[PDB]
Amino acid sequence: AMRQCAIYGKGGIGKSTTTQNLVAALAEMGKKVMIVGCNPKADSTRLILHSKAQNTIMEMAAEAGTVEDLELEDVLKAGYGGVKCVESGGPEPGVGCAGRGVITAINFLEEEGAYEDDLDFVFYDVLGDVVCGGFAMPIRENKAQEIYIVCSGEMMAMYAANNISKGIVKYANSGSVRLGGLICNSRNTDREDELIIALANKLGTQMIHFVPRDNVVQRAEIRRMTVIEYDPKAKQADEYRALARKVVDNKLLVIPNPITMDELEELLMEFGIMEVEDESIVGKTAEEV
Amino acid sequence: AMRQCAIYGKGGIGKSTTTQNLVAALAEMGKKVMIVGCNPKADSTRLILHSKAQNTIMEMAAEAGTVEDLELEDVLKAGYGGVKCVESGGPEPGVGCAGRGVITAINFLEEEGAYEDDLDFVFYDVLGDVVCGGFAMPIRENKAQEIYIVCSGEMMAMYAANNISKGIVKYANSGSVRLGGLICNSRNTDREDELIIALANKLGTQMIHFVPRDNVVQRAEIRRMTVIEYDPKAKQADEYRALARKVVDNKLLVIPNPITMDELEELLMEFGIMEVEDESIVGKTAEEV
Ligand code: SF4
């Protein structure tokens, strides 16, 4: 029973680092896993392969002329734990849709049969900075049924998480696509552990894990490797193991309930990241009030 | 001579705040300016209109059934300095392309003739987090000829800036679309003033302004207004005036020269934001080295 998963979330909060460390812990569970990277920069596999940047299907279809002129040897690599690694590649900037890099990539892996081969998990590392039909490709073409959203106690991350949810909603009533939970990637904001459980409930799922911000994640990272690989005996290593536990063992897959902007500011004001408004000074000069 | 401009750049570095403050100083120059907001959240006009969030063409085409059922009174507002303000609106999450909200909006303004009416400047606030053909709509349909990119001394902002540039390149040899310069929105990183001039040269333009990070921008902002409007006698107000000067007076419009990733890490390592690599430890456990 090979399960199809995707890790969606906003950029710059270290989504990929957690995707890769989660996956590394699952290979330590003895699960064969394949990461399909879907970002324009090739950052979705570089901790598993010890790479500066893995070569992408777009760059190499450009070398060969078309996609059929490519063989799986150099498209799909494997590293720590025989974790298979593809990078889809980015759209030609300013002209292509991002989504077509990702279909080109899934189609190329269905055809050279990497999907029905021995695998336990597929994980698509997808950006959530814009929730358009471009980035919703693995949702719409029913390639990822289990979506876990990475966020933090901060507006844009949570905004992203809600919008990803609205998309799961449209496609839920014509497929197996469900939200399996949220993951807080700590930004050391005061009581964000709580904030993301609050959000996870008003959406109808759980906060399946709180990932703290250790120092070792950064020290393993400058070595182009995971914390599971660098120091298995650290606190943080156990954090990812525990997340990878919960993901196998999870059966709480839902069709979420998106909130409003007003409701979202509630959550941010209540837990104190957002400042409680004063319209008694809105629109007034330095001098007036 | 009404000039068509776009402000492209990565999110979360306060692009919109500088777009709106720049435009506010131009209304103080006595220029009629229209901001066309292109982001899925309505944050491109809210400092000019003192608004929580301006209503968007997408939400209101949804009310009325189609776009023709809308009149310019409530689509296009005006605030501080008779600065016209439209918000394009976002794609239905997970299904539409972002680009079609922006064509639907420019087409609606061409037809109800807001473009040939008395105007000096048009400014499209466009996201740069993904440089796909979706967000390159104002470039491809030759609606913005002068593109000024906002960035900072940090990897992703610079990456964004280069990618926007690759886009200007593809569309330059079939239109008047040019890069008029970069703008560093300081993040108080040590010597980023320098870094962005270095980048602006290896690309072939200029760093047309350095915008510092004042405290007053934040205090004007919680009042839903610009610094030009809140305290004209601050240092920061003068900063935006100087930028708005340079933009009118600018005639250095180019077809840029994108650099590589390697060249980009050069610039980051040279000015000290990026750490000088050691591959003598890449791939080694805590224990080995
Ligand atoms: S659908 Fe999204 S990724 Fe595709 S071209 Fe449009 S905005 Fe870009």
Which strands sit side by side in the sheet containing B178-185, from one edge to the other? B77-79, B83-87, B33-37, B121-127, B3-9, B146-151, B178-185, B207-211
Asked whether the CA dihedral B45, B50, B52, B58 is positive or negative, the reply is negative
| Terminal alpha carbon distance of chain B | 65
Shortest distance, CA B195 to any CA of chain A (angstroms): 21
Q: How far apart are CA A55 and CA A172, in angstroms?
A: 33
State which approach was used to obtain the coordinates: X-ray
Q: How far apart are CA B151 and CA B160, in angstroms?
A: 8
Closest residue on chain A to B172 (Cα):
A94
Number of inter-chain CB pairs under 8 A, A vs B? 137
| CATH number among 3.55.40.20, 3.40.718.10, 3.40.50.300, 3.40.50.1100, domain B1-289 | 3.40.50.300
Residue A6: φ, ψ to 5°: -140, 140
Q: Which two tokens stand for residue B73?
A: 């009174």
**Residues A152-178: b if buried by 16+ CB within 10 A, e if exposed:** bbbbbbbbbbbbbbbbbbbbbeeeebb
Q: How far apart are CA B134 and CA A136, in angstroms?
A: 14
Q: Which two tokens stand for residue A45?
A: 């596999």
Q: Is B14 annotated as a binding residue?
A: yes
**Residues B146-182: b if buried by 16+ CB within 10 A, e if exposed:** bbbbbbbbbbbbbbbbbbbbbbbbbbbeeeebbbbbb
Q: Which residues contact B202 (CB under 8 A, 6 or more apart)?
A: B257, B259, B263, B267
Helices B155-172, B192-203: axis angle to 10 degrees equals: 20
DSSP state of A157: H
Ligand 1 contact, B99 CB (< 6 A): yes
CA B252 to each of CA A22, A223, B160, B246, B255: distance values in angstroms, whole numbers, following the listed order: 49, 43, 21, 10, 10
The amino acid at residue A251 is K
Residues in A 248-287 with any Cβ partner in B closer than 8 A? 261, 275, 281-286
B183 membership: H or E segment, kind and range: strand B178-185
Q: After which residues is chain A broken (C to N over 2.5 A)?
A: none
A65 CB-contact burial (10 Å; exposed 0-12 / middle 13-18 / buried 19+): exposed
Q: Which residues pair with B124 in a beta bridge?
A: B6, B36
Interchain pair B94, A136: CB under 8 A: yes
CA of B96 to the centre of ligand 1 (A): 8
Distance of alpha carbon A285 from its chain centroid, rounded? 43
Secondary structure class of A181 (helix, strand, coil): strand
CA of B15 to the centre of ligand 1 (A): 21
CA A163 to each of CA A44, A170, A263: distance values in angstroms, whole numbers, following the listed order: 22, 11, 14
Residue B191: φ, ψ to 5°: -140, 45
List the one residue out of B51, A12, B270, B27 whose CA is nearest residue B19.
Answer: B27
The amino acid at residue B3 is R
Q: Which residues pair with A78 in a beta bridge?
A: A84
DSSP state of B232: T
Q: How far apart are CA B131 and CA A127, in angstroms?
A: 13
Catalytic residue among B69, B74, B117, B129: B129
The amino acid at residue B110 is E
**Residue of A93, A140, A282 with shortest CB distance to B50:** A282
The pairing of strands A146-151 and A77-79 is unpaired
Q: How far apart are CA A267 and CA B252, in angstroms?
A: 47
**Rg (Cα) of chain B, in Å, rounded?**
20
The pairing of strands B77-79 and B83-87 is antiparallel
- Residues of chain B with C-beta less than 8 angstroms from the C-beta of A231: 285-287
List the one residue out of A192, A177, A172 whose CA is nearest residue A124.
Answer: A177
The pairing of strands A207-211 and A33-37 is unpaired
Ligand 1 contact, B228 CB (< 6 A): no
Cβ(A260)–Cβ(A162) under 8 Å?
Answer: no
Residues in A 173-212 with any Cβ partner in B closer than 8 A? none
Q: How far apart are CA A234 and CA A9, in angstroms?
A: 26
**Residue of B40, B95, B139 with shortest CB distance to A130:** B40
Helices B15-28, B235-249: axis angle to 10 degrees equals: 80
List the one residue out of B176, B193, B283, B201 whose CA is nearest residue B239.
Answer: B193
Location of structure tokens 């006009």: B45
CA of A147 to the centre of ligand 1 (A): 20
Residues in A 80-139 with any Cβ partner in B closer than 8 A? 91-98, 127, 129-134, 136, 139
Cβ(A140)–Cβ(A175) under 8 Å?
Answer: no
Q: How far apart are CA A105 and CA A143, in angstroms?
A: 12
Alpha helices in chain B (DSSP H): 15-28, 57-64, 72-75, 99-111, 137-140, 155-172, 192-203, 216-221, 227-230, 235-249, 261-270
Q: How far apart are CA B215 and CA B168, in angstroms?
A: 34
Q: Which residues contact A205 (CB under 8 A, 6 or more apart)?
A: A179, A180, A181, A182, A252, A254, A256
Catalytic residue among A69, A117, A129, A190: A129
* Residue in B132, B163, B173, B268 to test binding to A, most A beta-carbons within 10 Å: B132
Residue B199: φ, ψ to 5°: -65, -50
A28 membership: H or E segment, kind and range: helix A15-28
The amino acid at residue B71 is E
CA A83 to each of CA A1, A119, A223, A234: distance values in angstroms, whole numbers, following the listed order: 17, 10, 18, 22
CA B154 to each of CA A28, B90, B171, B186, B188: distance values in angstroms, whole numbers, following the listed order: 35, 27, 27, 10, 11
Secondary structure class of A227 (helix, strand, coil): helix
Q: How far apart are CA B20 and CA A232, in angstroms?
A: 49
Distance of alpha carbon B239 from its chain centroid, rounded? 17
CA of A97 to the centre of ligand 1 (A): 5
Q: Is B16 annotated as a binding residue?
A: yes
Cβ(A84)–Cβ(A123) under 8 Å?
Answer: no
Ligand 1 contact, B97 CB (< 6 A): yes
**Residues A114-128: b if buried by 16+ CB within 10 A, e if exposed:** beeeebbbbbbbbbb
Residue B160: φ, ψ to 5°: -55, -50
A284 is catalytic: no
Q: How far apart are CA A150 and CA A185, in angstroms?
A: 7
Q: What is B204-229 written as a DSSP string? A: TS-EEEEE---SHHHHHHTTTS-HHH
